[PDB]
């Protein structure tokens, strides 16, 4: 037992009363008084006392007392004395069934946070207490017990699944299932909500009972209560993903019931139902079980893709046309998003088979006079595009012109979704004669880039970037107009849209390439970019996209970038240097210095490597005057994989040109580069192989010692078929380059790498990397034919992969083929290939 003193109790009640004042100064001052009184050992005990024994006090005061006790728990429970902790536990369990739903909710969260803050083994009797209390004859105790149980199961599923308190679930799951029968709908909702927490974990206590679970779940399917239907749909989604075998016998009835729920009047029930279509489309059996239901399902999903009245109001689409929280509200998942995504995945799985069901609906929506219906039709046409392109093509000559008209529609929403749909059909648009569809499309899209409405602007920029990626060189005749409008966009845009504008400009540079290097384009594009570059300070996060954009420009312009190089270069160095400095400082004293944002040095290395790539030898007079070398060395010493990746990329680029200044540091680079290679941080390993290739081909025969330490690691990488194709291809390329410059160490290894070397390099398009790698393998076979006797078929395949190679490479292949045809076998090898490859071999 414990008792309060009257004056202290009354002072605490007065503070709780004053905590409800509208005056923020009163709130702050009484919060301060409370934070001070928290020092009192039994303050929390008075607080629970107000929550529980003073039934005479008004419910808001009691509720807030409970909530602030919950905060005190979360912050300080570890230093509560045992007496008050026991009082809290016992008393809140005594009042878990209090009449007021508000009091019962506060007590529920208080119990939940006590149990979560401590370990359940700090309160071992809690679960038996709640389980036994579920059997209450009084309703309120039962309801509160089950509510707190639901919260505990949601917060603490894993700890309940552990051996902690002797597998409690083994008794609870039979209990919860037994309460699916309960008369009160709220109790049934709690029961299903609790059981649902243990489906995805595949908890044995439940999976030992899935038959009873699904039987009672179907017995419960017909409930009137929206919460019950919500939780039943959620349970069936999870069970589909996990224990699909049991659901499969009843899949037809489950599908029909879940479609009925997809049409449910309550929006939450409908959303839960739509998740069923998304998850089912991911199971391999979907294309066989759901076909019979498509004619009933597609019209439903389509009908679900209309905006709700609430979305139309929030989007202000209702308004004539002559913010951040708006986005927060719209973006959040809803029935429209989910229906569109479900239709998208259904399109991906059924492809042309789904077209004859949706197309009659689509050709009604597209030309409907209600703008909401038209908008949903545009969204439908855009959603199925990716999966259904091959069957949709015949109608594009008819639809694309109307979509291009819709880009001029009065309603902003129609305009935006039209931009996105045309983006989805960009590839087919590009395939056609430019003057027929591409030029009108880009004209309208650029007119919308400067639209009045910001989401229209964002949609237009995204669509134009995708269209550029499809168009590539097709853009060049229109490049003046593209640049004019984009650089005008800088003068209009605002920060939220400015990053997608950067996306558009960077994509333009990437797709156009050296064609962008004209004086008018340079003096039109650069001034605003360097204006933003001067505007931003080194600490601004908005600097990440800009540099990520600028690098593209810098490479696309190649030497044309030179007048703007030096101030960029210098700053780009300083950034990484700073991030290194603080980083090591943070490593020395984490309390004195926080870990700096690695993204600055990552993007700085990326931009600097791209700058070296673009400028070639012209960057030598800068890197000679810089500490850059040491810095990137440290960047490859750093454990973080991204900086290692970026620094090896920069090493490769500074090796393509200006290697003469890198060379003295090779003795320091190579040991750590080879060491970093093998652990196979996929991107880091890939760049490490490629850097080894560059530095080896630069070094020549002088590379003697660095070959053994890398070659064993490289062939070990080739030993792993799990390597992604790019990494393995570059490993083979660098093996070839090493075999070219230093054969003697590679001489034993031909048999170990030639086969995957062939199967990888046969699919790279005859560039200088492939040229040097094949030169290397030719050198290797000339040095050791014995290593490829059992593998000449792979050599023939690799040599045949070349389409009209250089004359000297052709002669090397020719001479070595006429060599090992003598040194039947060559005829049989060439017979393994189709007419083209065999003919190429014969011509050689």
């Amino acid at each position: 037992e414990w008792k309060p003193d009257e004056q202290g109790l009354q002072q605490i009640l007065q503070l709780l009363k004053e905590s409800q004042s509208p005056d923020t100064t009163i709130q702050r001052t009484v919060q301060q008084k409370l934070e001070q009184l928290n020092q009192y050992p039994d303050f929390n005990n008075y607080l629970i006392f107000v929550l529980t024994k003073l039934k005479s006090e008004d419910e808001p005061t009691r509720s807030l007392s409970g909530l602030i006790l919950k905060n005190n728990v979360k912050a300080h429970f570890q230093n509560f004395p045992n007496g008050v902790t026991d009082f809290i536990k016992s008393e809140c369990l005594n009042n878990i069934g209090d009449s007021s739903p508000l009091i019962r909710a506060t007590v529920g969260i208080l119990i939940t946070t006590i149990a979560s803050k401590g370990e359940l083994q700090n309160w071992p009797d809690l679960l038996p207490k709640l389980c036994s209390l579920l059997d209450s004859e009084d309703y309120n105790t039962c309801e509160g017990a089950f509510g707190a149980l639901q919260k505990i199961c949601e917060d603490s599923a894993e700890i309940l699944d552990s051996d902690v308190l002797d597998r409690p679930l083994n008794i609870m799951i039979p209990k919860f299932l037994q309460f699916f029968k309960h008369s009160s709908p709220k109790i049934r909702s709690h029961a299903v909500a609790c059981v649902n927490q243990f489906i995805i974990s595949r908890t044995q206590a439940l999976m030992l009972h899935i038959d009873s679970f699904i039987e009672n779940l179907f017995a419960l399917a017909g409930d009137e209560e929206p919460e019950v239907r919500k939780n039943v749909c959620r349970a069936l989604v999870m069970l589909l993903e996990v224990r699909m075998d049991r659901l499969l016998p009843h899949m037809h009835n489950i599908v029909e019931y879940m479609l009925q729920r997809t049409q449910d009047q309550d929006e939450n029930v409908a959303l839960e139902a739509c998740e069923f279509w998304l998850t089912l489309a991911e199971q391999p059996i979907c294309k066989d079980v759901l076909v019979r239901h498509l004619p009933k399902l597609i019209p439903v999903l389509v009908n679900g893709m209309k905006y709700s009245d609430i979305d139309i109001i929030l989007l202000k689409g209702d308004v004539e046309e002559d913010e951040i929280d708006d986005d927060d509200t719209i973006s959040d998942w809803n029935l429209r998003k989910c229906s569109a995504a479900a239709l998208d995945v259904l399109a991906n799985v059924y492809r042309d088979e789904l077209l004859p069901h949706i197309l009659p609906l689509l050709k009604e929506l597209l030309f409907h006079h209600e703008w909401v219906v038209k908008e949903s039709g545009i969204l439908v046409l855009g959603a199925i595009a990716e999966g259904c392109m091959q069957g949709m093509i015949p109608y594009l000559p008819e639809l694309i012109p109307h979509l291009i008209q819709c880009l001029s529609d009065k309603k902003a929403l129609v305009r935006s979704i039209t931009c996105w749909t045309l983006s989805r059909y960009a590839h087919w648009v590009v395939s056609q004669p430019p003057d027929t569809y591409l030029k009108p499309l880009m004209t309208e899209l650029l007119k919308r880039i400067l639209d009045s409405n910001k989401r229209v602007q964002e949609a237009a920029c995204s669509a134009f970037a995708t269209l550029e990626e499809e168009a590539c060189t097709e853009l060049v005749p229109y490049l003046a107009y593209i640049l004019d409008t984009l650089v005008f966009a800088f003068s209009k845009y605002q920060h939220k849209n400015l990053l997608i504008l950067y996306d558009a400009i960077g994509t333009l540079a990437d797709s156009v390439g050296h064609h962008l290097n004209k004086p008018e384009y340079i003096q039109m594009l650069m001034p605003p970019l360097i204006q933003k570059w001067n505007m931003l300070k080194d600490e601004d996060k908005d600097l990440f996209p800009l540099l990520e954009c600028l690098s593209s420009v810098a490479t696309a312009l190649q030497s044309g970038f030179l007048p703007y190089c030096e101030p960029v270069y210098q700053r780009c160095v300083n950034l990484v240097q700073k991030t290194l400095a603080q980083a090591m400082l943070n490593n020395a004293q984490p309390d004195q210095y926080e870990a700096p944002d690695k993204d600055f040095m990552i993007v700085a290395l990326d931009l600097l490597s791209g700058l070296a790539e673009g400028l070639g030898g012209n960057i030598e007079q800068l890197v000679a005057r810089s500490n850059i070398l040491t810095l990137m060395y440290q960047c490859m010493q750093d454990k973080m994989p991204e900086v290692r990746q970026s620094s090896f990329a920069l090493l490769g680029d500074l090796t393509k040109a200006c290697f003469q200044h890198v060379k003295p540091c090779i003795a320091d680079f190579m040991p750590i580069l080879g060491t970093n290679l093998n652990p196979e941080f996929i991107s880091v390993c890939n760049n490490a192989t490629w850097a080894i290739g560059e530095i080896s081909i630069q070094m020549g025969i002088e590379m003697q010692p660095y070959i053994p330490m890398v070659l064993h690691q490289l062939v070990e990488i080739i030993n792993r078929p799990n390597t992604p194709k790019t990494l393995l291809e570059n490993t083979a390329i660098t093996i070839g380059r090493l075999g070219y410059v230093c054969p003697q160490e590679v001489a034993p290894m031909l048999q170990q790498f030639i086969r995957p070397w062939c199967t990888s390099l046969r699919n790279i398009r005859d560039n200088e990397e492939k040229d040097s790698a094949f030169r290397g393998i030719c050198t290797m076979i000339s040095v050791n034919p014995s290593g490829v006797i059992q593998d000449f078929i792979f050599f023939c395949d690799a040599v045949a992969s070349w389409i009209n190679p250089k004359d000297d490479l052709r002669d090397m292949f020719c001479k070595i083929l006429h060599g090992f045809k003598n040194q039947e076998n060559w005829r049989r090898f060439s017979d393994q290939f189709p007419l083209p490859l065999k003919e190429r071999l014969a011509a050689f």
Binding site: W333, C338, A341, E458
Partner: peptide, 12 residues
């Protein structure tokens, strides 16, 4: 990598 879309799930 991929651009914003109309049916993108929060927490891409």
């Amino acid at each position: 990598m991929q651009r914003p879309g109309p049916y993108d799930r929060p927490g891409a």
